């Protein structure tokens, strides 16, 4: 539908919109006029991906100067597939309207799990083993040995892509992972390296977060592309958690024992290759002395492992010290390994700053700072040198070498915390070593430096006052869009009152209180007896879901929940969860009642979305606090007190509410979807915790619904479902919660859309 | 159960519900933050029950 | 602390993870129980390769590779000398080659002939013990002192941050409690219309917090 969004025509790929839609489109015109970042909040009602891709395609169709390339970033591979197919719908609409005058290269991109063909690599199930066999079958040196012989191993895909495939760009076709694999089958190529080679020619690229924010993966979108690039994150609550997962490094005693075995293996390899060859070691010493390890770096496609984990602006251009002879570098890694192993021997929890660890190094095993920076460059050049094949075998030592880089680079923001035993362990032999970071800003800092205008957008983000206060961030637009409705469409209730008038809570900190778990089971039973077609029940921790569903069996509850609906409990297997989800979705459609109870942290509620009739009543059990984790929490909170200015009790409440309202706000797809969404404990009524739920849920949280009983909540659920199971046809929306062609041109509608959207 | 998990899998893992590979870059416990997820130690009696 | 186990008097490391191992000239292993059990039975006779220990030649450290102990001790005794920093050379390649020469001298004292090594040490140690070696001893002592001073400054700042936030909490708690008790003792013993005095109380609370 041909929108006027105050400067430009926009072909919306549906012949109807919401008003929330056009408010979002106004504010995103605002963010792309002035080159600034902006944080938006469209709730899950609209097609925010639909709108988002529509306006970015409108700018790229209308302005070939300011915006070169869209980099969408959605976090899970099914969301990659969804965003590609909505882009494909919009191109099909775009080509219905005009004809085959498209040229538009949509492109997904994930990994060698999902773009490899070869029938000996394909039956591997893991990412590192697929990377190892792809490093076996092609390299910089195995490819040359095949190039001057015949029977040496090769893929036939990368070789044929090397033969012809690097001169024909992909003509204007929006490609999924499946379509791209099919084109790799067709002419006979690698679609992995085709996708990476065709990053340069695309207009929309849709990959994951860790393919952009990791400094040791994202070396594939250069500066000149980034100066006119628009990056759009999507579902971006845990950006700070992605950063802290993206730069912290964990060392384990098993990692160090396999590092010792690796060190002996590489010592034997240096001995036998010293018996074999000498001339390329002379060339090694040349390209260390002469250059800065870039001699054979021009032809480097599959010879690249994970790069140096320092950021793009803190790397150096000097010569690697005393390291040069590989015998002495094995001695260097030997010293570093034995010192970190001796440091890990301490049988109490020890927190250090990284300069204290560097001084303990530089005093007690004589290793200085700059040869400890260049350890990543040295191990990558050495491991390229000695022709060795299966790099999965060398996963620990590279880890250790990469750990060395971080210890020798960053200070005052990061923290080296040593644990002799974990929290749920105590006194079992797992001494681990978190080089943990707590600057969230030091991983998105080159993302704001390089890129023009990055757009954090999610359905839930609250409060918006804190994402500039964590990410070292100053946006143009800080927008919240109010859910305008012609029908209530949702009701949140805070069931914080047992049927015995017992205060429902989780104050006990996972050590079971009996009557509260009793009232949780009573809530689940009676809400099962009311709600149709699938109830989703998020607990706090898997130990707590474990303990709760344990004491729902010895206590006589869970058979009654069986009598009403079919349970599908969760486990932390990767395949058992998928089978329980599949049976849960085959039981919401074959008549019976299905109820999926999970944990509000894991992968069950990150990508796997619950649409019109899969979850009607999202039961958020408890307030999700990170309670199991170590002094990483205390140290990140001490950091946010000190060098940012964010309180203890402010950040804990913010984190708990972003997880709770993250897991709740998936139930609703459109305006014609209705989701009961209950919150079950009293703490969600206490003003600060309720104050950090998003605006489109606080708008429909009535003071009567605030602190309901179990049975009052059940009767509100019954009245909700009965008032909201009637024919709510399209003719009930054209006034309020929908807009036609000609309902847009009225300036009264423009006054309405001015009144809907607000800023912070 | 192991035949449903290993010899079989999720049939409608086509665009959702594929919980094993709903993450494009899954690694080992080496270079992460939450590496203490599945512990090879700590097997109790009531917990296994 | 879980290594294969002490050679001679095998009890220490298998039972007690509270020890440390001492190396000899030839450099294999000796624990404190080995040390004492060996000193009572010869005092300077290697347990396996019978090397002629010069004079009591034992050094206690905490590592579980003997070549690591050898390299650490020899590396300290070499890097006591050869102290020319990057400040001291004109170019960068000469400094990196100098560090590689130091690595060559350490690996030669590891296994090669110790004669030419000692002559090279004679020349460089004399020619630079004139000027540079003592100067860099002084400078490294200065940097050790200032790093210990800077770590104590960091810990003073952390103690002040802890204690000042504690005094923030206790000052606001005692002060708000005295505000409330004073407002009760002023509702009692005054004669005002009620809404004005209650507005003064709310003004006291807002001027207290904000
Ligand atoms: S080169 Fe291509 S076909 Fe061969 S393993 Fe790598 S991705 Fe698969
Ligand atoms: Zn002994
Ligand atoms: Zn000996």
Swiss-Prot record, chain C:
Chain segments annotated as transmembrane: none
Full-sequence portion shown in this chain: 1 to 210 of 309
GO biological process: adult heart development; DNA repair; G1/S transition of mitotic cell cycle; negative regulation of apoptotic process; nucleotide-excision repair; positive regulation of smooth muscle cell proliferation; regulation of G1/S transition of mitotic cell cycle; regulation of transcription by RNA polymerase II
Stated name of the protein: CDK-activating kinase assembly factor MAT1
Tissue specificity comment: Highest levels in colon and testis. Moderate levels are present thymus, prostate, ovary, and small intestine. The lowest levels are found in spleen and leukocytes.
Record localization: Nucleus
Underlying gene: MNAT1
Function, as annotated: Stabilizes the cyclin H-CDK7 complex to form a functional CDK-activating kinase (CAK) enzymatic complex. CAK activates the cyclin-associated kinases CDK1, CDK2, CDK4 and CDK6 by threonine phosphorylation. CAK complexed to the core-TFIIH basal transcription factor activates RNA polymerase II by serine phosphorylation of the repetitive C-terminal domain (CTD) of its large subunit (POLR2A), allowing its escape from the promoter and elongation of the transcripts. Involved in cell cycle control and in RNA transcription by RNA polymerase II.
Alphabetic keyword roster: Acetylation, Cell cycle, Metal-binding, Nucleus, Phosphoprotein, Transcription, Transcription regulation, Zinc, Zinc-finger
Residues with PTM N-acetylmethionine: 1
Organism for this UniProt entry: Homo sapiens
GO molecular function: cyclin-dependent protein serine/threonine kinase activator activity; zinc ion binding
Zn-finger region bounds: RING-type: 6-50
